[PDB]
């Protein structure tokens, strides 16, 4: 809503805005085939857990989908048309999204960096930064009927699984990517960049990181920074003031 | 395969209201530094006595 | 006009109290500047030579000075010029990180 | 709901804007709230040479 | 639907099509004014059938 202003003459009617975003579902499949004779002619129970392997193969998709999202967040778009991690996110000086836009940055960049970036998110409010929508629950099918066409004409059992789901982005103000070393200075720079975002019209949003996601190769630095009670800050032993504030998520990008 | 037009395919979406409140406002913390007094008329006048 | 109108109105006002109970520090958020503000506020006097009893209770900083506040007030052992010393001003002040909502 | 929240937020936007621009708004003694010339008279009655 | 043929051998899977069309609607207004006095002294009832 427009901010309240002093009433001198007659009420001045103003405008507001609405936003929109869409995520499209995609289908997935995977199948394997074993002969009927070989399946029914084992006594060691070696081919038994094919159904369990089916379930465990389709129960790992969400992690892969979500973490492949963040990784390529510099190319895929968000609701305002730019990329999720972009240095040109428009913020207008009017509530109705009308005025001279000023480009707000979502990325922390270090000079001549060729490493693995790490991300800072705020998973505390109603809307989480990333969305995972599932269209159809995974279905596991084992074609073993003797009158089945494939069984009848080929004497082969068919084991197949199929899923229909996708994933997408949420609010760009709730996620910051740091393309730099995992040091205290970069962490605090990302924190203060996240804390400084504000909505259209000067509206003050209260945002504060609650999770930090790092790849497997950054676990050393993450554990050396967020778990040491007494660390070094400029060749001096000082207390860790950021111990117990952020939550570490060492994702295997499953 | 039925070759539907683009508009018909665009209308085949489901509406979700997960994004309703937008981004919540900052916490309110003015009571820590301000004293609240109720006025009943055009203005308030305060007066104290020197030592 | 074939229009729907939504309107709000309030009657409020904000004013200043005593100037003697506030100090603005136009510098960096260092220990020295904080102590300068503390002592300057404690040095205030009333009319006629009376000695008022005042001392800071709250400290208000913008959201851009959060790093310096948390690295100065919420550290048990901090650095005092390349040596580790105990923090003597940990629980004295209450920190208000205002977004100027 | 949006206009209710906009109305509710105002007391903070008022108070915190008062400290911020306290170098220009005047206070009870006549000068600005944050100022380097705030008189302290040597007599209780408010009469002498201000310091 | 595709035309029915003579069934010799396997069936052939053909295709179909769909179409679309949309119409937007507008608003019309019309008004007339009569004084309160000239409408509240209608003994005859001449201005009554304006609806």
What does this structure look like?
The structure is cut from a larger assembly and holds 5 copies of chain A. Chain A is an alpha+beta fold and 254 residues long. Helices cover 20% and strands 28% of the residues of chain A. Chain A contains 6 helices and 12 strands. In chain A, the strands form 4 sheets. Chain A has a 5-stranded mixed beta sheet with strand order 4-8-5-9-12, with helices on one face. In chain A, a hairpin with a 4-residue loop joins strand 10 and strand 11 (237-239). Chain A starts with 25 loop residues before the first strand and ends with a strand. In chain A, 20% of the residues are buried. The interface between C and D is medium-sized, with 21 and 33 residues. Chain A: It comes from Escherichia phage Mu (Bacteriophage Mu). Chain A: Capsid protein that self-assembles to form an icosahedral capsid, about 54 nm in diameter. Chain A: Its main location: virion. Chain A: One of its GO terms (cellular component) is host cell cytoplasm. Chain A: Keywords: Capsid protein, Host cytoplasm, Late protein, Viral capsid assembly, Viral release from host cell, Virion.
């Amino acid at each position: 809503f427009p901010t309240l202003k002093e009433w001198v003459g007659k009420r001045t009617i103003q405008q507001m805005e609405a936003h929109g975003y869409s995520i499209a579902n995609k289908t997935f499949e995977g199948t394997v085939g074993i002969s009927r004779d070989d399946f029914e002619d084992d006594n060691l129970g070696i081919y038994a857990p094919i159904f369990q392997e089916m379930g465990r193969s389709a129960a790992v998709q969400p992690d892969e989908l979500i973490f492949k999202l963040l990784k390529d967040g510099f190319t895929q778009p968000c609701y305002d048309g730019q990329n999720f991690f972009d240095k040109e996110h428009p913020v207008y000086p009017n509530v109705d999204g009308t005025g001279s836009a000023v480009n707000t940055s979502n990325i922390v960049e270090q000079d001549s960096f060729s490493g693995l970036p790490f991300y800072l998110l705020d998973c505390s409010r109603a809307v989480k930064p990333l969305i995972f929508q599932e269209r159809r629950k995974p279905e596991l099918v084992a074609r073993t009927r003797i009158d089945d066409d494939h069984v009848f004409m080929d004497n082969e059992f068919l084991f197949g699984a199929s899923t229909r789901r996708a994933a997408g982005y949420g609010f760009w103000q709730m996620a910051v990517a740091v393309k730099g070393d995992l040091t205290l200075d970069n962490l605090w720079k990302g924190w203060q960049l996240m804390r400084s975002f504000e909505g259209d019209g000067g509206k003050k949003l209260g945002l504060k990181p609650t999770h930090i996601v790092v790849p497997v190769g950054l676990e050393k630095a993450a554990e050396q920074l967020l778990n040491r009670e007494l660390f070094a800050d400029g060749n001096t032993t000082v207390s860790n003031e950021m111990k117990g504030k952020l939550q570490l998520v060492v994702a295997d990008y499953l | 395969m039925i070759v539907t037009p683009a508009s018909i395919k665009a209308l085949m979406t489901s509406w979700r209201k997960d994004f309703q409140g937008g981004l919540e406002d900052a916490p309110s913390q003015y009571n820590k530094i301000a004293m609240v007094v109720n006025s009943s008329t055009r203005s308030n006048t305060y007066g104290w006595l020197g030592k």
